[PDB]
Nucleic acid binder design. Structure first.
Ligand code: MG
Ligand code: MG
Ligand code: MG
Ligand code: MG
Ligand code: MG
Ligand code: MG
Ligand code: MG
Length: 101
RNA sequence: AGCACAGUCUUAACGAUGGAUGUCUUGGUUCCUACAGCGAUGAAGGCCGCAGCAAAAUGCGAUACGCAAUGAAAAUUGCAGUGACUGAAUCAUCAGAAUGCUGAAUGUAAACUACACCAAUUCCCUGGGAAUAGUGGUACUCCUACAGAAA
């Protein structure tokens, strides 16, 4: 069991680890994403390469009035994660789209 | 409106082709002088990023072609925008802050963003109130000290 008289390294700086702002970067337009928004209430977000599904969900919860049933993700060949977020039935992605912009 | 045979060869003039010559020169080279190490406080090297419109190089590191601070000091400009009337636009300086993933690489791994285990960790306010699966730590060898067990 450790009992160091002082800790070795103490990062006093504000955390570098990615917050909501930084994790999730921006929604996608593109005809595909628009279609998704219209038809099956799935919002498409470009996110950081090092976002997990859990993390993305958390971000979405924090950044917007969104509850997400399921999140699929993929790594784009442009070095971004694209997260397809299916909203719970209580919410209309269209309305939330409008709210965001 | 006419007249040259055509080809081959030659000469001259005027052009094409090419990049010689000459002229340059933010480069090299040599010599001289001067200092002289970086790294578990994570080096060099490598990746991945980072610009409003951004490929390379250049610079930088999730504060990402820069932050603070200092010394200049009114511009910057391709457009957009940002500034002056001096901690501000731009330079230099650079001591503060920060410094992604790696790499000796060091928790086990490695064509894995695979996997353990131990601390949960972090921030705010003057003992509470908030967050986030996030953050640290754990290599081998060695030294001094301590520990309680072994002969
Ligand atoms: Mg998948
Ligand atoms: Mg003839
Ligand atoms: Mg030496
Ligand atoms: Mg400054
Ligand atoms: Mg000044
Ligand atoms: Mg390792
Ligand atoms: Mg394998």
């Amino acid at each position: 069991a450790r009992n160091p008289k002082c800790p070795r390294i103490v990062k006093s700086c504000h955390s570098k680890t990615l917050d909501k702002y930084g994790l999730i970067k921006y929604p996608l337009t593109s005809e595909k994403a628009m279609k998704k928004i219209e038809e099956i209430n799935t919002l498409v977000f470009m996110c950081d390469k090092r976002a997990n599904k859990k993390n993305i969900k958390k971000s979405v919860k924090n950044l917007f009035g969104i509850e997400c049933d399921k999140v699929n993700v993929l790594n784009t060949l442009n070095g971004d994660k694209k997260a397809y977020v299916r909203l719970s039935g209580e919410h209309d992605a269209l309305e939330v789209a409008n709210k965001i912009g």
